[PDB]
């Protein structure tokens, strides 16, 4: 489970829980499990950042990236990766694409699978193998985060 697919799932998962347009049909237990988790944290991130989240214009797809990489570098410069941090990424990726669907030019429908990609592509390089060694997704994660 910390091959590219399963965790560009799990990205892609996310946002369209956040936009309100699950994939018709469900998502794995994986999934439900992290929604919950990652959505609590994003609620809390954006009532405490509200004036600052204003000091963007998402207008595109490179502008989301370009923030998600200062973000990311800032989140793990003290080189820990826990499973906090982990969350973390999904609840970014969430005000990222409320950010886009608001400011983005030329809206896309297609741009929470770009912005799923390049966050996906940052977990497995950067954690990967920390997320592996820790249970992966359904042996670490799912037993850490799932209900008591
Ligand atoms: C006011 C802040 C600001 O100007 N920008 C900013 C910075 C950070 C950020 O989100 C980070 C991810 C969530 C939070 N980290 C966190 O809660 N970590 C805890 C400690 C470790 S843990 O995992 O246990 C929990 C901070 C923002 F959402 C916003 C801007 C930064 C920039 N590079 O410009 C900014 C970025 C992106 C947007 Cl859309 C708007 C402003």
Redesign the pocket.
């Given at each position: 489970d910390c091959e590219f697919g399963y965790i560009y799932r799990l990205a892609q998962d996310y946002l369209q829980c956040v936009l309100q347009i699950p994939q018709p049909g469900g998502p794995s237990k994986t999934s439900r499990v992290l929604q919950n988790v990652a959505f609590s944290v994003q609620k809390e991130?954006e009532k405490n950042?509200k004036s600052?989240?204003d000091?963007?214009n998402?207008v595109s797809v490179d502008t989301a990236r370009t923030?998600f990489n200062?973000?990311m570098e800032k989140?793990f410069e003290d080189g820990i990766i826990?499973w906090?941090?982990i969350?973390?990424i999904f609840?970014?990726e969430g005000?990222?694409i409320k950010?886009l669907l608001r400011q983005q030019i030329a809206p896309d429908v297609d741009t929470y699978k770009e912005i799923s990609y390049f966050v996906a592509e940052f977990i497995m390089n950067n954690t990967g193998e920390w997320i592996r060694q820790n249970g992966g997704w359904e042996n670490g994660f799912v037993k850490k985060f799932e209900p008591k």
């Open positions: 991130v950042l600052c989240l000091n963007v998402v923030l200062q973000v989140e826990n906090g941090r969350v973390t609840a970014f005000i990222l950010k």
